[PDB]
RNA sequence: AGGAUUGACAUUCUUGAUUUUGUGGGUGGUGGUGCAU
């Protein structure tokens, strides 16, 4: 039996304004019953300031097991509940900065919050919101290459594709697993889903902002099948720019 | 060197890398340290009293025929960004690697078994 | 009535917020001191003592195993690149009209490249520049120093002897002034001090001697500062 | 790791490459207005 001031913790931290933090709740990384007693807090009661400080301390105490302990049962769900209460689809600024401070540690972020966002109830609006808060702040380069590999292996959905679109306008320096990833993306989008799914201007801007300058380690057969991408999926945005990138392409 | 590469791949499955002096002595006083690759004669006999003392204590603890080179260990291993993948970065990182949780994958790891079979 | 109603509503509501803030702070001190060092009584009762993850770690291992790069930051069209060049052209024109209205320590460069006659200086100095700026994590005074001594080197070379290879000296000093201008288009604040110091000393040179303290390297000093 | 950065029990400890500094450079999307809602 815990000392039973967690009810008092929720009582203040529902109507917090500004000031300080509880010290048991601060040293709770180094007390072994932290999740078993945060169930006793039963924290459906919540505030922006305490969300900020709580995810600060949880990324401070974030590994794989702690990610599955807290963030995969209630935290992304509280993100989801607040964007289902925000009637303009207007997420709040403190909750934004809580997600930016969540994106600090890349150690368990994948299975932490990147997997179950596409799992249940995913719209393209919240997909672009999550992609843009990825585009604001720091991202791990090689872990994001790994992310691009498994998210392109993951099945086709416009939320996954707009995550790849924003993370491709992140403007990396392309490695070899990624260029093989994009060419077997082209082996994915062939005739295939070309009779089962339609890809308008959004996917056209995907390979258009790809083929802006993402061309550097590309074989002449790969130049051929990007020209065949253009030949089949001709939109109006194919002629001078993709011809120009074919002319200025390299080995 | 292929055994070092496949045990590096095993540590890249596990990824709980506590490659430090205080975490190493905590794993020394607890029952977790089983494969530590640590260079012996570098800095005025810094660690070789207690790690070799608890090595000669009756546990196996030594799958070591020769300690890997400290200049290239951690930067042929996994540490950092892309970090000069084709530019051959051999700068000193941690240079001490521990393999955790019984250190054994499936049947293609008989070479580490015959490594810590003998002394 | 509107003004007093708004002021009374805002004052009573700020007083409500002040009561909530002060009550929250007092309760925060009470709960913190009541469960901080007192939950070491309940820290004696009870204690609590990878498929897609490994696929992600395998892909991150392959990314750490081999990587490459992308060219330079953008891709630009012909007419858009011409528009940017035209903006730079008109910028330089109007700024010029508004202006018109209103490894090298003076011997280390020669002691380094003092083996061959004419061609080794160009390639070795371009390699010195591209070897300083590549791994230059702080090398700015080194940059300024070799710009200074390449100035001094063309000074004490352009009037030693050109009665040897005139065509080879012609192409190597055309190369030296062209590489000089293309790099010192960006670095004036180390170059100009040494130009002013050469002015400052050659004035004393002409003060001392009637004519025989004027080199003919002074002429190419005038021409390369006039082209810079 | 022969020590970067994260949790500080105020000076001394429970993290671990997300670093770090330079050398560069992209603007910053939590937007409305005409369409079949």
Curated annotation (Swiss-Prot), chain A:
Q: Gene Ontology cellular component?
A: 90S preribosome; cytoplasm; nucleolus; nucleus; preribosome, small subunit precursor; small-subunit processome
Q: Which domain of life is it from?
A: Eukaryota
Its localization reads: Cytoplasm; Nucleus, Nucleolus
> What keywords would UniProt list here?
Cytoplasm, Nucleus, Phosphoprotein, Ribosome biogenesis
State the Gene Ontology terms under molecular function.
snoRNA binding
- Major place of residence: cytoplasm
GO BP term, example: poly(A)+ mRNA export from nucleus
**Record-stated family:** Belongs to the bystin family.
- Other notes: Present with 21600 molecules/cell in log phase SD medium.
Q: What does this protein do?
A: Required for normal export of the pre-40S particles from the nucleus to the cytoplasm. Its subcellular location and association with pre-40S subunit shifts from mixed cytoplasm/nucleus to all nuclear in RPS19 disruptions, suggesting it acts after the ribosomal protein.
Q: What is this protein called?
A: Essential nuclear protein 1
- What phylogenetic lineage does the species belong to? Eukaryota, Fungi, Dikarya, Ascomycota, Saccharomycotina
Gene for this chain: ENP1
UniProtKB/Swiss-Prot annotation, chain B:
Answer yes or no on keyword NADP: no
Q: Output the GO biological process annotations, alphabetical, semicolon-separated.
A: cytoplasmic translation; maintenance of translational fidelity; maturation of SSU-rRNA; ribosomal small subunit assembly; ribosomal small subunit biogenesis
Q: Where in the cell is it found?
A: Cytoplasm
Descriptive protein name: Small ribosomal subunit protein eS12
Protein species of origin: Saccharomyces cerevisiae (strain ATCC 204508 / S288c)
Q: What is its main location?
A: cytoplasm
Gene encoding this polypeptide?
A: RPS12
Q: Which GO terms describe its cellular component?
A: cytoplasm; cytosol; cytosolic small ribosomal subunit
Record keywords:
Cytoplasm, Isopeptide bond, Ribonucleoprotein, Ribosomal protein, Ubl conjugation
Swiss-Prot record, chain C:
Region called Disordered, residue ranges:
62-94
Record text on subunit structure and interactions: Interacts with snoRNA U3. Interacts with EMG1, MPP10 and NOC4. Component of the ribosomal small subunit (SSU) processome composed of at least 40 protein subunits and snoRNA U3.
Between which residues do disulfide bridges form? none
Its family remark reads: Belongs to the NOP14 family.
Its biological function?
Answer: Involved in nucleolar processing of pre-18S ribosomal RNA. Has a role in the nuclear export of 40S pre-ribosomal subunit to the cytoplasm.
Localized where?
A: Nucleus, Nucleolus
What this protein is called in its record is Nucleolar complex protein 14
Top-level taxon in the UniProt lineage = Eukaryota
């Amino acid at each position: 039996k815990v000392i039973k001031a967690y009810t008092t913790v929720g009582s203040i931290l529902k109507t917090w304004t500004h000031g300080k933090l509880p010290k048991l709740f601060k040293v709770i990384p180094s007390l072994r019953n932290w999740q078993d007693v945060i169930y006793v807090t039963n924290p459906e009661e919540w505030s922006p300031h305490v969300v900020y400080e709580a995810t600060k301390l949880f990324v401070s105490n974030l590994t794989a097991k702690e990610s599955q302990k807290f963030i995969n049962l209630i935290l992304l769900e509280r993100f989801r509940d607040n964007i289902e209460t925000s009637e303009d689809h207007s997420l709040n600024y403190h909750i934004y900065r809580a997600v930016k401070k969540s994106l600090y540690k890349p150690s368990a972020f994948f299975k932490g919050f990147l997997f179950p966002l596409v799992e249940t109830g995913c719209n393209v609006r919240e997909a672009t919101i999550a992609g843009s808060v990825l585009a604001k702040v720091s991202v791990p380069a090689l872990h994001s290459s790994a992310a691009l590999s498994y998210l392109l292996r993951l099945p086709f959905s416009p939320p996954t594709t707009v995550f790849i679109k924003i993370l491709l306008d992140k403007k990396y320096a392309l490695p070899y697993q990624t260029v093989d990833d994009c060419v077997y993306y082209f082996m994915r989008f062939r005739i295939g889903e070309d009779a089962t799914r339609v890809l308008p201007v959004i996917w056209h801007k995907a390979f258009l902002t790809f083929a802006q300058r993402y061309k550097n380690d590309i074989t002449q057969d790969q130049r051929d099948f990007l020209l065949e991408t253009v030949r089949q999926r001709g939109h109006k945005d194919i002629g001078p720019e993709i011809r120009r990138e074919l002319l200025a392409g390299a080995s | 060197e292929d055994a070092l590469k496949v045990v590096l791949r095993t540590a890249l499955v596990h990824d709980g890398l506590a490659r430090g002096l205080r975490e190493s002595t905590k794993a020394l006083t607890r029952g977790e340290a089983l494969l530590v690759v640590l260079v012996s004669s570098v800095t005025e006999a810094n660690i070789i009293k207690l790690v070799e003392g608890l090595a000669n204590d009756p546990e196996n603890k030594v799958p070591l025929i020769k300690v890997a080179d400290a200049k290239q260990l951690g930067e042929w291993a996994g540490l950092g960004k892309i970090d000069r993948e084709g530019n051959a970065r051999k700068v000193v990182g941690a240079s001490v690697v521990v393999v955790k949780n019984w250190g054994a994958e499936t049947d293609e790891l008989s070479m580490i078994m015959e490594h810590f079979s003998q002394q | 009535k509107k003004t007093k109603a708004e002021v009374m509503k805002e004052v009573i509501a700020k007083s409500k917020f002040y009561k909530q803030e002060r009550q929250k702070a007092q309760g925060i001190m009470e709960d913190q001191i009541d469960n901080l060092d007192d939950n070491f009584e309940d820290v004696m009762s009870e204690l609590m003592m990878t498929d897609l993850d490994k696929e992600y770690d395998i892909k991150v291992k392959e990314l750490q195993l081999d990587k490459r790069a992308a060219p330079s930051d953008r891709t630009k069209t012909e007419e858009e690149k011409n528009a940017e060049a035209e903006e730079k052209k008109r910028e330089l024109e109007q700024q010029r009209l508004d202006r018109m209205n209103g490894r090298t320590h003076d011997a280390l460069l020669d002691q380094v490249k003092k083996l061959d006659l004419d061609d080794h200086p160009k390639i070795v100095k371009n390699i010195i520049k591209a070897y300083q700026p590549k791994l230059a994590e702080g090398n700015k005074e080194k940059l300024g120093k070799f710009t200074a001594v390449l100035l001094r080197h063309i000074i004490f070379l352009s009037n030693q002897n050109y009665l040897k290879n005139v065509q080879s000296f012609k192409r190597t000093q055309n190369a030296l002034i062209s590489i000089l201008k293309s790099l010192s288009e960006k670095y004036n604040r180390e170059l100009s001090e040494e130009c002013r110091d050469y002015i400052n000393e050659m004035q004393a040179r002409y003060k001392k001697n009637h004519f025989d303290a004027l080199s003919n390297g002074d002429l190419v000093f005038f021409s390369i500062i006039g082209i810079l």
